[PDB]
Each structure stands twice: as structure tokens, then as C-alpha cells.
Scaffold this active site. Structure first.
Site, PDB file in Angstrom:
ATOM      1  CB  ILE A  59      52.485  72.878 -11.224  1.00  0.00           C
ATOM      2  CG1 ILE A  59      51.684  71.976 -12.172  1.00  0.00           C
ATOM      3  CG2 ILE A  59      51.538  73.611 -10.267  1.00  0.00           C
ATOM      4  CD1 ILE A  59      50.739  72.683 -13.108  1.00  0.00           C
ATOM      5  CE  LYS A  60      56.744  80.867 -12.575  1.00  0.00           C
ATOM      6  NZ  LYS A  60      56.476  82.216 -13.084  1.00  0.00           N
ATOM      7  CG  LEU A  61      54.430  74.446  -6.232  1.00  0.00           C
ATOM      8  CD1 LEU A  61      54.408  73.464  -5.070  1.00  0.00           C
ATOM      9  CD2 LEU A  61      53.336  74.074  -7.171  1.00  0.00           C
TER      10      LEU A  61
END
EC number: 2.2.1.2
Lengths: 316, 316
Positions: free
Chosen positions: B130-132
Site C-alpha cells: 500500500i503506497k502512502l
């Protein structure tokens, strides 16, 4: 007669300088200093006495080099404020160490330390504004300080998020910048020339003024940072304006009466829920000018603090 | 033979695109998408089926227009990820709504929602990142997600503060940017041409890599954002590099062997105390490039999310 006199019909004029000469010449109600203006004033020959007193005072407080540097820089800033208070009937603004701008607890502690030094010199809190950068952390610091009877001046105010958060925190005063906003727009857009009414700093302060008055907020709105008298005259009616001696001179030398520009006549409107930290961060960072200039202003004030510490360190 | 093959001796190559054609051609280990690349991929005619499935799926979940827009956008991003996973043996990176970048709790909830959609489609967490955005809030979100078995890709990493905070949070992977740093320096300094070794993006990643390996951090370092193959070759040896199809093509078409550039051979050094939020904010804002480009990146990814919602809204 002259534009300075005419402006004073509508707006409380404040002097932006550490130089007592300007207080004598223009008789302002309040004065503002900042770490840069303290650094500059420390170069005035007749201020040598103040630096020496600060160092002498610091040497009485401890035998520790690091602490003496801190005590001496603090006492210098307060000494300059004391001299200004002899010649102005209202407030002096004294800024906390900008290196503390993202630390609420440290900012609260530094503000109280400055306040103690003033109080010990016989000056009450109603004559002082502690200046803090208007980061979330400084706004939170200010909110607590006001509750303890310490009035604050929230500086480096660029975004609407900042303005809103300051009002909601009940701070005594805000200094929304004008000239540095103009600087940013010249550097980052193709438009290099602005009519006074189109100046993006002027627009910023005008919109903040409207928002505060329309919701009944009692926070004083004080325009700061100016590149030209056109900006100042477009804000006639702002609660206060803090103006550098150079522009005070141009106003005093300019003949002609001016009209009031900033007023609000309507109903008090209901307030929203308080802006949360997350919402504040989102909205501040929607504003690329504000993002840049808040961070930059803090860096520059911290550098001047470091230069002040080097000067003081050279005298220990 | 060719520079792509030679690079692969030293670095895991990852494809930066939502286009399955590139996965077939270059056979990367992982792939990365982002909201802009999702918006772009949604324009590919053969992807019409995926958009339609997303909308059909969203219409099964609720009768609410607003929720259907959110469900459809989320399911589209996941559908594109599902198609990529059929052709790549490693990870897919999928980015949370950038509008949530300064909100830890909302970012945690969105990450888990994306993870659920993947899990329901039969895909385990070891195939997903998951990219943040690497704001304090996103790093804090990531810290928690990793503890819950959700691996993260911390993106828009520009300042050392960000790099240090990410390592200390134990995030699975970081994507320190190269090309956008170069962009900032060309725009804000007089120096417009850089030797590969002098490229400030290259220098940034090189210094982050050294710090991570010298302190025994296990977070994967993945260079991202490239303007030219010179940048990529200067980082040979980086754990992973995510590269756009255009530059993958240039590497594959360039003959000659390359040397490894990034290595660390020495002792594991003692770690400092964890950086505090206040220290992080101070140190991030010491870096004017990082200040500008983190805030900008978030604005741009949020705009593309909005454009995605408009397209989906037009199909309901």
C-alpha cells in the site's frame, strides 16, 4: 496634509523596527521587533550599552557558556523592548527563538521566560506581545499562553488555514504578511506588476479581515511586511498596520487625504466547527505560496538567531 | 549485451506503469502504480472491461451515488493491480487517496479497505504494497499497518527527515524520488546540467542507502521517478528501482556492461534515539526542495484522484 496622518484616522499605526529614533520621530502606538531586527539593532552604536548589560546579566545567572549565550540573547531582546516601551504607549512584540517553531512545549516555556524577564523589569503583560510563527505548534502554544494571561502575535501568516486556526485559538493578534506574498507571486508566476487592489498580499489580508469580522472574532488583524505604500493604502482600515521606517517616511512625505478601504458592515455569522489538525495540514498545503514562505521565514529567523548567538558568544 | 540485463545483476527491476503490455515485454519482478498512472491506464481501450467491472461491482455494494463513486474508483485501481499480478511474480503497489495524506486514521482505514478488496479477490498480503505519502501522518499510519501484516511503500520521500523517520517506523519499503529533485534544482538554481554523479536526486538516494545499510535497517530502498538513464545507472546496486517503460526501453536498447555503484561494506553502527515529531518537522522544513515537492506531489495525486472520480461519476 499628509498620508500618514490620513491613514491614522482609520488604522492604528505600529512601527516595524528596533530603533528608538523611529519611535521618537513617528510616535507609533505599538512597535514590533523580530530576530532579524534585533540582529540589526544590535549593530547601532548607542545600543552597545544594552548588549553589555545583557552579557553582564547573563554572567550573573550562571557560569555555563551555553546558558550564558541563551540568557544574553534573551536579555538583549528584552532590553531593546524596554527602551522602546519608554517611547511607545502600547505594545512591544518580541519573537521567540524560531528554532522552536515546531515544538509547542518549548515555545510555551520560552514565551514564559521572556515574560518573566519583562515582569522582573517592572513591565506588565498588557504591554507585551510574544511573537510566534503560525505553525500548528505555535498556534497551539499561543492558545495555551492566552489562557495564562500572555498575549501573542502570530506571525508568518500566509494561508487561510493559518488565519482560521489562529482565530479559533483566540490569539490576541495576527500579523498576516503582505510583501512576502507579493515576492512569491513575482518569482512563481509570469505576472510581475500588480495594481494595489490586485496585490496578492493585499487580497490575503482583505479576505482574512472579512472572515474575522463577519464571524465576530476579536483577534487583532495587523498587516505586516510591505514592499510599497500602495499596499499600505489599500489596507487603510485594517485594525493595525506595522510599517518600516522607510515607508513611514514616504507616507509622511506624501500629500493628500486617503479613503478607508477595509470595512465590514453586515451581520455576525455562525462559526463552523473548529478546524482539526489534519484539516489544517491539508488546507495549508493546498497553498504553495504558504508552504514555501512559512518554512522559509522560519529558516531565516533561525539563521539570524544563530548569528545573534555567535555575536554574544564572541563577547563572553 | 544490454544495460537492462547488466543492471539486473545488481538491482531488482520494477516497472512503473499500469500497462500490462510493459509487464509482458520487460518481465519485471514488481510493478508500481499511482493515481496518475491509474488515471492514464483508465484511458487504455482494452481496460474498458476493468472500468465496467468496477462500476458493476460498485453498484452491487450500495444504492448511494457518493459511495459508488468511491467503491468504483477503489475497485478499478485494484482491478488494474489484479491484472498486473497475473504477469508479475512479486508485488503490486497501489496508492491510497492522496487527500488522506495528513490523516493517520483515515489512511489506515483506506489501506485496510484496499487490502480487503485484494484479499477477497484471492490475493495475499505478501503480494501487495500500500503506497502512502511520507508525511509524518503517513509514516505513523505505515508503522501501524506493518504491525497488522500490511506492507507499505512510503512514497514522495525527499528529505533526510522523511528517510530517517521511515526507517525508524520499520516500513517495508521506501520510494525516494530522484527525477522530481532534479526538476526542483533546475527550476530554483542556475545550474541546469548535472553529471550523473552530481544529480541531486542521485545524491539523495545514495545518502539514504548508505544510512540504511550502515545502521542495519531492513526497509527496502527503491529509487523512483527518473528523467534519464544516467540517473538509473548511477544507482546500480540499489535494492530495487522502479522505472517507466520509456526508460526500460532505453536501457534494453543500450549495449554495454555497467558497474555496480551503490554498496555498503563496513560495520553496523549504533542507532540514535528515535526522531520525535517536532524534530522531524524542524528537519524536514530545513530542506526547501522537500518542503515544496512533498506538498506538491500530494496536491497533484489528489487532483488525479478527483479526475478519476469525475470519469466514474459520468458512468453511473
Amino acid at each position: 496634509t499628509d498620508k500618514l496622518t490620513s491613514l491614522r484616522q482609520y488604522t492604528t499605526v505600529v512601527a516595524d523596527t528596533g530603533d528608538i529614533a523611529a519611535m521618537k520621530l513617528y510616535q507609533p502606538q505599538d512597535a514590533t521587533t523580530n530576530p532579524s531586527l534585533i540582529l540589526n539593532a544590535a549593530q547601532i552604536p548607542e545600543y552597545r550599552k544594552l548588549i553589555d548589560d545583557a552579557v553582564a546579566w547573563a554572567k550573573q545567572q550562571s557560569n555555563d557558556r551555553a546558558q550564558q549565550i541563551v540568557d544574553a540573547t534573551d536579555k538583549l531582546a528584552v532590553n531593546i523592548g524596554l527602551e522602546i516601551l519608554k517611547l511607545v504607549p502600547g505594545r512591544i512584540s518580541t519573537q521567540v527563538d524560531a528554532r522552536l517553531s515546531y515544538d509547542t512545549e518549548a515555545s510555551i516555556a520560552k514565551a514564559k521566560r521572556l515574560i518573566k524577564l519583562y515582569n522582573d523589569a517592572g513591565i506588565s503583560n498588557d504591554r507585551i506581545l510574544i511573537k510566534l510563527a503560525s505553525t500548528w505548534q505555535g498556534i497551539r502554544a499561543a492558545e495555551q499562553l492566552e489562557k495564562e494571561g500572555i498575549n501573542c502575535n502570530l506571525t508568518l501568516l500566509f494561508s487561510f488555514a493559518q488565519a482560521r486556526a489562529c482565530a479559533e485559538a483566540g490569539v490576541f493578534l495576527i500579523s498576516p504578511f503582505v510583501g512576502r506574498i507579493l515576492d512569491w507571486y513575482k518569482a512563481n508566476t509570469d505576472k510581475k506588476e500588480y495594481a494595489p487592489a490586485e496585490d496578492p498580499g493585499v487580497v490575503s489580508v482583505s479576505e482574512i479581515y472579512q472572515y474575522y469580522k463577519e464571524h465576530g472574532y476579536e483577534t487583532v488583524v495587523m498587516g505586516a511586511s510591505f514592499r510599497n505604500i500602495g499596499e499600505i493604502l489599500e489596507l487603510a482600515g485594517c485594525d493595525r498596520l506595522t510599517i518600516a521606517p522607510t515607508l513611514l517616511k514616504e507616507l509622511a512625505e506624501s500629500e493628500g487625504a486617503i479613503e478607508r478601504k477595509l470595512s465590514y458592515t453586515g451581520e455576525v455569522k455562525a462559526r463552523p466547527a473548529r478546524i482539526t489538525e489534519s484539516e489544517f495540514l491539508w488546507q495549508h498545503n493546498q497553498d504553495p505560496m504558504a508552504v514555501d514562505k512559512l518554512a522559509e521565514g522560519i529558516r531565516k529567523f533561525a539563521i539570524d538567531q544563530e548569528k545573534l548567538e555567535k555575536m554574544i558568544g564572541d563577547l563572553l
